[PDB]
């Protein structure tokens, strides 16, 4: 059973058994807002990460694809001979 609860109380967390009929839609819009901030944060963290050591080319270091410090180093290091 479900405990009785006052209908007149408004709580932003939703309350006692809140699930709006449009919960799927709102859960998608908020996900997109959540996604965009992370993209904004990821772009920041790619730009301002600092490393004093550079990964070897063969090793699994997936950050070399999106960070600027390593990409600039690898671009410059490709010039040989």
């Amino acid at each position: 059973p479900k405990i009785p609860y006052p209908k007149h109380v408004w709580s932003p967390a939703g309350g006692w058994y809140a699930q709006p009929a449009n919960w799927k839609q709102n859960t998608a819009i908020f996900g997109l807002v959540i996604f965009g901030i992370t993209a904004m944060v990821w772009k920041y963290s790619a730009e301002h990460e600092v490393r004093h050591k550079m990964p070897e080319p063969d090793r699994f270091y997936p950050s070399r694809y999106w960070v600027k410090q390593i990409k600039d180093y690898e671009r410059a290091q490709k010039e040989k001979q």
């Binding site: 479900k2 209908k7 007149h8 109380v9 408004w10 709580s11 939703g14 309350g15 006692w16 058994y17 809140a18 699930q19 709006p20 009929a21």
Partner: protein, 74 residues
């Protein structure tokens, strides 16, 4: 099973709308309004803190030694 979201925001019953006491005008546009405008002007405000003036001098005075590297030597 789940209940539909309920509750009265600001105590307003579903039949009617929130009534205004007259503070809302000046508070939302005069008080908060001016507080966002000031925030915008603060981004363009020149930086007159003693620290940044001092770091610039501390930099050169450190560049005279071997701790830092002069971008434009001599």
């Amino acid at each position: 099973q789940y209940d539909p979201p309920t509750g009265w925001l600001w105590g307003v019953r579903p039949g009617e709308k929130y009534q205004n006491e007259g503070w809302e005008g000046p508070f939302f546009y005069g008080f908060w309004g001016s507080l966002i405008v000031f925030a915008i002007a603060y981004a363009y405000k020149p930086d007159t803190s003693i620290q940044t003036w001092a770091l610039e001098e501390a930099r050169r005075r450190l560049e005279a030694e071997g701790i830092l590297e002069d971008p434009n030597p001599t």
